[PDB]
């Protein structure tokens, strides 16, 4: 019979699901409002507590996801869903819904960590209702949270002031994090013990709320897979105002004051802001025009209440509060799905020195690397060989170092001379439920791992007994780390500590420890861009 | 000589003074006075909102709006439910939220005279306060007669079954007049500790919803349901509310993603454009060719878990509403005429046969609510006693009142009784000359005869007859009594018996005298075919 | 270094502009918000309080004007300013802003008086960027803030009833007020010392803020130039339905009711609702059709909040609190810029008896003269002379009188009967700054004054010392009068109380004190309308 909890708000009745093998059932929740509908007058404003409801609420229907671009999210979520068969999703601002995978047993108490999942997408697509939580949920006994919080324009338009600040989507993910900590105990979890992962932008947001004291008593172990808070790409640095005109513009908006824009924006159609979206033509690398004007992207600003100053700033001070946090990468994160998305000119596979100079200076919206840097960069890198296959290879790491490697390594390290736990590790396998267009050479891709911690094995088929144990040995891993802020267990290899000596884990076929990651290109990096 | 000034909790009214015939005082008229804020723009689909204080003397002379409904229907009705002369033609508007006050009181004196409140009928889609002036039953019965207003259709009603729309709006609206009432009554000459509540129809059953409801608990202290209750179900709705929710969000042109959304876009919907969704969804009609069990929800009363926890049903059997005494009563002859003729029934001919009925029985599933599986089992309880097919025709008007109205107002009065709460029914019988003349004379005691003598048209109107001007009189008499006393009876009157055990009501007529058991059978009966 | 300062709702960033003759440098900031603003839902309501920001504001940009008639107010601007060169401004709702013009040096402690002046311009133009307030603030040391406040439909739109009482922009005159007893100290002004002043519908606000308990302990001292609240053509008396409705109508809303008629127009886009301004022809004079009918412009109205009773009934009340009060008027209020702007029917420049008598009529919502007493008008002013080129200017001395002349001269009268101290002066000089387009015999022309008061001479090119002069010795009284409620001072002429003697002083080439200003034309005016 039906699981029905009763949270804050009312009761939600949700459905038990049985994964082959493990007797107690999980209870799936699919919907759990945690906030207002962000409607009409509600639009750029931080997010207001749900209404309550009187009787039973039926969870049993994944909820839209954020308006984005209908088409490159139901892409993302096609290569990144963990279950068997991809769930068409719909689309509107009414998307602040969270979903709950709990194997705690609810006629009783229990106090199961809890894991809060925070997608990725670029701030600008994705979903919760793409990643399943039932494998980890039952086979580490944890309680999975996946959270939406809104996109693009609807969560990131700011004016860079008061009417508009900002990071509105940043604000939805701590008002998730909040109800987690007024409801879950409800659902068999222990709110005493909270755990943020995400990847990418998900990972990115997980480093912002590391260091934001609004989130301070919100989680007590932290997860950053491909993606920290010193991606260049997702933190917009200084006058955000211009970008703010561009997009009124593009909406068929005045520009006289911010609140003119504001105010002009908020009667827009949810339609109107997606045509608005479409056509500045985010998330796609730009071949005509100033590589410094083009915006892939709008994203996390220092609004001044979520951040008081940029990350660099707030790193330094020893100030964030500290927690066990894992910082990970893949071995090679820019080496297909990124590309691919974003339509890089790559068709030849092969690359030549002038060519790379020349991409390298498009992307400068990925890279923020001065016009005068590139032939130190690209020399660099691709210097070392006369072969234009590996040029082109190399070309990707460069890209990969400059946008997670250095910026995780260094977070890393900030957070380590900060007094606390860390944890490091290098994710390089491939696995089989890689999509057919991704070229097989192709090892440790951006969201690799993502099949691994979500147990795709066990929902979806063709798992090898390689990719199986692999899966396992990761979840294992996260969920320690989730229970004692340290992933090490009997039954797996040791992962040490990412101390002084730097050591991390690496993960894939063969796992083992490893040191000083990254170690010469944050040398590298550091020092070029300090010039 | 000079128009009356009272002031009130939110300020200054000016109203106006009229004389009627065999009254020294002249009686104070205030129209259109505001109890609540214009449920207009992200308002709408709320609960209502005080009103705003004004700053000098509010004028309150000219009859307000009604709220949007059909201007055709709502009109027809008006002219056919007018105790008035002339009928007053209406504006409509969102801003309808406004109540009409009457008082027979010297407002240079203290005055403590009961009150009245008057909630009008049809169907919860269209109505106006307007239509009834209370001039004569505040005269003569010394009372202080109030009607009110309260959003209808779409606008009251519009229901999404979940916390972005719980529904009921209307229902709000009333329990907010009657708060205003109890903080300004006493102005008008008003004793704010002697409010009865009383409507016709959906005003019935409005007034049968307010009386069990925690939300109208201390704001009346009698309550009259004249033909109608909460279990004239087909003003209740019991289930998923959800698709009409999502039939009517189509039908304005809106998306259906969630209802937060189909609210929101609602909300931004123009006055005439849900207006027209409204006249789309053709309610008030009967669909004689799709499916019955489909053929229109109809808007209307839902358990939304804050005017109505529960169904009618679970809250009769509950005792637990706080007990006032009641009066319910019925018409002889409910679906006579006025109803069908309003629906524009399929009974062109004045010929009915078995075969027929069924049908009809059937594609009236929307007002009767009969299983098909049951249609033949009451059809023939009623159809089949004789042969002449007018005969047939004739008991199934009297299958249709005895479903909707008859057998749900005594098993209502029967719970109220059993909750040892003081209850009284009446069941009128007779035949206004105010009549319209497309009305069979064969009908007495249709749908709607009894509002002619409540209030006091024979008074109003011209060529009233002695006996029906006297049959107004005992009505208003025992009207206000009950509403004084909580018992209709007093001196120069009948005696009314009360509704206990032996479950005597009054029979109201040329001839008025006390019966009992009142659709006895008919109740047995039909409990029994839907108990399945 | 810019000078950054602490109010309320956070940090202001300025500029120093220094000015010939002084060493202490001008603090000036400019578009501080006062409230927040009136976008939306908040159009025709009270101004609430502006919302606090996070960092530091740059107060370094003229905010845009209040919307209304672009080419009127741009032409009233440059007409009235008193910088050499006009600023061109933007139209906006979100007009709530004031500027501030600080002489004190803000690294110390300072209480110097402060001045807010309220721009005149019929409630339908205007702005307060027109106004720089360096002069006055370097020269005579005081604090000067120009303030703005909603205008036409905007700042007025009144149904007469709680739906919408109208006076917004009088209530954001409070407002504003208000703003500058919580912050000024912070710009080294004392909220201890407040003079209001303003010109034309500025000087009517003044004297209507005199009159109401709204800003009861707002002010100090008060100043009105040209404009009180006698000034017929800005109060409202009697039923305003119908004009409320005719706006209505002329937007294209339903009449139903207050409620619906407010919330149609709370729906119309700014532009929308400035077709409907001009299609109104506000501030012009109506030829064709009856003067009884004619709507030169909406104002003040008798709400029941800032203004419960007349301006009349309140002044002989004695009740409103006393505070020192100048009341001043121009030669020729009529003289030029007025009869231009409305486009007067004076192009003979030569009238008669006959033609006199038909435009005392059409310029009915202007005087406020019933037909059957234009005769005895024109007669007692223009039946003197047989000239009709004389004709016409007694004519244009007629419409001042009754317009400025006269009410001024009885609102003085009963500030003073009431018992506060009162003051009056008639300026008559003619500005080197005036307008080719105007006549030279035009001496005193409305908003004369407004160059000596603001300094145009320190400013503007070709000031003569004589009129460098004028401005000092006018400066001088206006400061003094704002720090003593007094305006003598050690070497400056004589400037006698307004008491029973009626004393007042005459400004110009030779300024000098009299006696009973308008006495006569007060006498026979205020017979005539008496019938
Ligand atoms: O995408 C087209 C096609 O290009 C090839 C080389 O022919 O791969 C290049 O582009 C990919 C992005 O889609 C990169 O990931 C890859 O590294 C680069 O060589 C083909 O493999 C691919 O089918
Ligand atoms: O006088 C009107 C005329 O109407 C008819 C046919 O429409 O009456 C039928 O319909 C009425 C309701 O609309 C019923 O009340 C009536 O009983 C039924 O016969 C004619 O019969 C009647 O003469
Ligand atoms: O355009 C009108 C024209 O009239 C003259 C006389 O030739 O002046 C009169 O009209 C002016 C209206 O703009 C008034 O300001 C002026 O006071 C009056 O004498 C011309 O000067 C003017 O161009
Ligand atoms: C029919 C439908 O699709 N809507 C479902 C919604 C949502 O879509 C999600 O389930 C999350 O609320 O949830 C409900 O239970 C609810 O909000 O009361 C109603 C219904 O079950
Ligand atoms: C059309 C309409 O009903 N609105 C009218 C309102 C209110 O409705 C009344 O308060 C109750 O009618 O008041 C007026 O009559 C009035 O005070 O002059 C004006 C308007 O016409
Ligand atoms: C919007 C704009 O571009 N103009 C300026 C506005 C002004 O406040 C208003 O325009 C009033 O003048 O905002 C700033 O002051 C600010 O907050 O940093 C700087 C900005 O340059
Ligand atoms: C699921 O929700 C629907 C409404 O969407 C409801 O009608 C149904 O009864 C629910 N199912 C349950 C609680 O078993
Ligand atoms: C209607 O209101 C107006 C002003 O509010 C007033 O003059 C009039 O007396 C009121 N009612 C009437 C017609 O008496
Ligand atoms: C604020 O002022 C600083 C100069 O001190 C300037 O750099 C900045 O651009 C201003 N803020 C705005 C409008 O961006
Ligand atoms: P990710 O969030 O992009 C980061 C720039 N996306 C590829 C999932
Ligand atoms: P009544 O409200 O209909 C009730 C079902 N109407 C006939 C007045
Ligand atoms: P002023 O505001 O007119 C007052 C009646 N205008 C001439 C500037």
Same mark, same amino acid.
């Given at each position: ?267 827009? #159609? +949810?339609?109107? @802001?997606?045509? !608005?979206?479409?056509?500045? $033509?985010?998330?796609? %690398?730009? *071949? ?89 960069? #690209? +020399?660099?890198? @691709?210097?070392? !060989?006369?072969?234009?296959? $590996?040029?082109?290879? %190399?070309? *990707? ?107 991390? *884990? ?26």
């Amino acid at each position: 019979s039906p699981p029905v909890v009763d949270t804050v708000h009312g009761k939600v009745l949700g459905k038990f699901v049985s994964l082959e093998g493990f007797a107690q059932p999980v209870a799936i929740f699919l919907g759990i409002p945690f906030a207002k509908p962000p409607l009409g007058p509600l639009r750029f404003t931080p997010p207001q507590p749900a209404e309550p409801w009187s009787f039973v609420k039926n969870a049993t229907s994944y909820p839209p996801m954020c308006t984005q671009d209908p088409k490159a999210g139901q892409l993302l979520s096609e290569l990144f869903t963990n279950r068997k068969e991809n769930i068409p999703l719909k689309l509107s601002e009414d998307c602040l819904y969270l979903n709950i995978y709990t194997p705690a047993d609810l006629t009783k108490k229990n106090r199961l960590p809890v894991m809060v999942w925070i997608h990725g997408g670029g701030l600008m697509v994705g979903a919760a209702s793409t990643y399943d939580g039932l494998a980890l949920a039952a086979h580490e006994n944890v309680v999975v949270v996946t959270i939406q919080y809104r996109l693009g324009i609807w969560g990131f338009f700011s004016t860079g002031d008061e009417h508009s600040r900002g990071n509105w989507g940043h604000l939805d993910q701590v008002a998730a994090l909040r109800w987690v900590q007024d409801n879950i105990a409800s659902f068999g979890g222990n709110p005493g013990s909270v755990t943020i992962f995400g990847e990418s932008a998900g990972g990115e947001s997980v480093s912002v709320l590391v260091l934001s004291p609004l989130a301070k008593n919100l989680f007590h172990r932290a997860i950053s897979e491909s993606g920290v808070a010193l991606t260049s790409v997702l933190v917009k640095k200084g006058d955000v105002k211009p970008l703010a005109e561009q997009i009124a513009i593009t909406a068929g908006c005045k520009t006289t004051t911010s609140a003119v824009m504001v105010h002009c924006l908020r009667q827009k #159609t +949810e339609e109107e @802001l997606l045509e !608005t979206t479409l056509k500045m $033509k985010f998330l796609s %690398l730009d *071949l005509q025009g100033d590589p410094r004007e083009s915006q892939p992207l709008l994203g996390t600003v220092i609004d001044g209440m979520l951040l008081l100053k940029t990350p660099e700033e707030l790193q330094a001070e020893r100030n964030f509060h500290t927690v066990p946090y894992m910082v990970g990468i893949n071995k090679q994160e820019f080496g297909w799905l990124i590309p691919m998305l974003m339509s890089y000119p790559l068709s030849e596979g092969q690359l030549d020195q002038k060519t790379a100079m020349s991409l390298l200076w498009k992307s400068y919206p990925l890279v923020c690397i001065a016009k005068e840097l590139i032939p130190e960069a #690209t +020399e660099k890198y @691709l210097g070392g !060989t006369d072969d234009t296959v $590996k040029k082109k290879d %190399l070309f *990707l790491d460069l890209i990969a170092d400059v946008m997670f490697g250095v910026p995780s390594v260094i977070v890393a390290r900030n957070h380590r001379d900060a007094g606390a736990p860390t944890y490091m590790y290098e994710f390089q396998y491939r696995p089989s439920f890689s999509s057919d267009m991704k070229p097989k050479t192709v090892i440790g891709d951006h969201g690799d791992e993502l099949f691994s911690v979500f147990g795709a094995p066990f929902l979806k088929e063709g798992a090898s007994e390689e990719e199986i144990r692999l899966s396992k040995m990761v979840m294992k891993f996260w969920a320690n780390f989730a229970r004692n802020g340290n992933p090490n267990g009997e039954g797996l290899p040791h992962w040490p500590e990412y101390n002084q000596k730097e050591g991390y *884990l690496q993960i894939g076929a063969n796992t083992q420890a490893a040191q000083k990651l990254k170690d010469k290109e944050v040398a590298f990096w550091t020092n070029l861009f300090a010039k």
